[PDB]
Amino acid sequence: ATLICGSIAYDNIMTFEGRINLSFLVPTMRREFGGCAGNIAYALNLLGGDARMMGTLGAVDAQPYLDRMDALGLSREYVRVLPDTYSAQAMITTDLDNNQITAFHPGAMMQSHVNHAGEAKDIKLAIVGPDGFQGMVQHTEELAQAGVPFIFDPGQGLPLFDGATLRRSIELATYIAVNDYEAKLVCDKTGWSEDEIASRVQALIITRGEHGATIRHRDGTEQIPAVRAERVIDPTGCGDAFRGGLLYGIEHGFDWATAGRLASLMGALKIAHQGPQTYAPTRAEIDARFETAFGYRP
């Protein structure tokens, strides 16, 4: 199984019909299931992987997410629901041109360190994604002492790290996945160059938006092509769908060329739909699309 550590949240995707006491009218709001862990586990589950979400919800409003996990067949064994607490929510204000500004209200995510990654059974692989700060650190420590290889994916939690804690997390990590902005930020905060970050992991994966991705590993760098999206509706969750694809690859022994292409394809499917988890390809569809884009079958 794969252990998916990160936020579990409701996303409120608010649309500003355009692009000091200033208001912006947002006539439409759409509520969606989100959170980094929920999004990545959704992607891995689409592929037929066995995803075990580890994260915290708040009892006040956890139930829809729990019912959705049950409907999807996603195990709830490491999802802790905290009494008298609200679930994390992302207030995602989006304009005309898909740019976004999020106010994230962490709620129960602030207590994510109540879950201990080192107690999880039959975990072969993990990811440590954006979450409560204490929980992110704790999971990297417990997975390393447990000998479970993990992707470190600090994402929106990067500003909670200082130099020392971020360098330590990279030492412990087996892989790192980031976008280019985040790669720069990791470089700046650690005082390490990109070469030096890459030297400390089996692979450093950098997504390049609509232009595919780069996978740097010890003796080479893979350039991963993008896949042309069928329509561009909403980027929220693209990174996470990519990461679901990448983890499926790693767990199933794919080479980096293939793992990266699968991850690129999941990103491209995601962007054609509103919200992080409303794309719903079948595994047969994913295989056919992979062949159409790349000329071979995973």
Ligand X SMILES: O=c1[nH]cnc2c1ncn2[C@@H]1O[C@H](CO)[C@@H](O)[C@H]1O
102 binds ligand X (CB under 6 A): yes
Q: Which is nearer to ligand X, 58 or 298 (CB)?
A: 58
Q: Which residue carries 């992080």 as its tokens? A: 276
Of 137, 266, 138, nearest to 207 by C-alpha is 266
Q: Is residue 103 near its own copies by the rule CB under 8 A?
A: yes
Residue 9 in contact with ligand X, rule: CB under 6 A: yes
Q: Which residue's structure tokens are 């990266």?
A: 260
Q: Does 154 bind ligand X (CB under 6 A)?
A: no
From ligand X, Na ion, its own copies, none, which one binds at residue 105 (CB under 5 to 8 Å depending on kind)?
A: its own copies
Identify whether the C-beta of residue 169 lies closer than 8 Å to the C-beta of residue 140. yes
| Binding-site member from 4, 34, 53, 190 for ligand X (CB under 6 A) | 34
Report the SS3 class of residue 42.
helix
Query: Is 156 labelled as part of a ligand binding site?
Result: yes
> Does 23 engage in binding with ligand X (CB under 6 A)?
yes
163 near Na ion, rule: CB under 5 A: no
Distances (CA, A) of 266 to 226, 241, 252: 10, 5, 16
Nearest residue (CB) to its own copies, 78 versus 152 = 152
Given the structure tokens 């199984």, which residue do they identify? 1
d(CA 293, CA 298): 12
| Residue list 174-203, contact with ligand X (CB under 6 A) | none
Q: Which residue has the tokens 């760098």?
A: 221
Q: Confirm or reject binding of residue 188 to its own copies (CB under 8 A).
A: no
Backbone gaps in the chain, preceding residues (C–N over 2.5 A):
19
Residue 208 marked ligand-binding: yes
Q: Which position among 75, 111, 134, 156 is part of the footprint of its own copies (CB under 8 A)?
A: 156
CB-count exposure of residue 141 (10 Å: 0-12, 13-18, 19+)? middle
Please state the closest distance from residue 226 (CB atom) to its own copies, in A. 15
Tokens encoding 212: 């595919």
Residues that bind Na ion (CB under 5 A): 155, 171, 173, 191, 200-201, 239
Binding residues for ADP: 98, 179, 207, 209, 212, 239, 264
Residues that bind its own copies (CB under 8 A): 14, 16, 20-27, 29, 90-91, 93, 97-106, 110, 156, 159, 179, 181, 209, 235, 239
